[PDB]
């Protein structure tokens, strides 16, 4: 009963991987864009936005 | 005298060196073992 969950997680993860690769040249810039607050950690509202 | 996996002009799809296909042993190790001192000459070695 978790097949829809696994499919949606896989689709979102692959889409985020390709979007990060196409937008950000490096990985530190991607992390700093994902985390706007500068605390060093990524929160749930940061992830959803 | 040619091994079956020697590098050549044949076009093959190359994977990482973890995968045991083609030439992997020759790429796993490192080239450099080049440390020595100059061992001087016959003349100074012999004539004391």
């Amino acid at each position: 009963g978790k097949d829809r969950q696994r499919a949606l997680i896989a689709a979102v993860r692959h889409h985020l991987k390709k979007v990060n690769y196409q937008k950000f040249d490096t990985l530190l810039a991607a992390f700093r864009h994902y985390d706007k607050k500068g605390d060093g950690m990524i929160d749930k509202d940061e992830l959803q936005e | 005298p040619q091994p079956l996996s020697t590098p050549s002009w044949q076009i093959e799809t190359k994977y990482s060196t973890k995968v045991l296909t083609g030439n992997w042993m020759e790429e796993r190790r490192k080239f450099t073992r080049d440390t020595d001192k100059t061992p001087q000459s016959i003349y100074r070695k012999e004539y004391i």
Partner: peptide, 26 residues
């Protein structure tokens, strides 16, 4: 990226066996 802490010293590994490039721990 090595200068910029977020990553522990154990997190950096060589990419392959006897290779110059550095990557992260999986």
């Amino acid at each position: 990226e090595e200068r910029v802490l977020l990553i522990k010293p154990e997190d950096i590994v060589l990419k392959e066996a006897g290779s110059t490039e550095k990557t992260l721990r999986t």
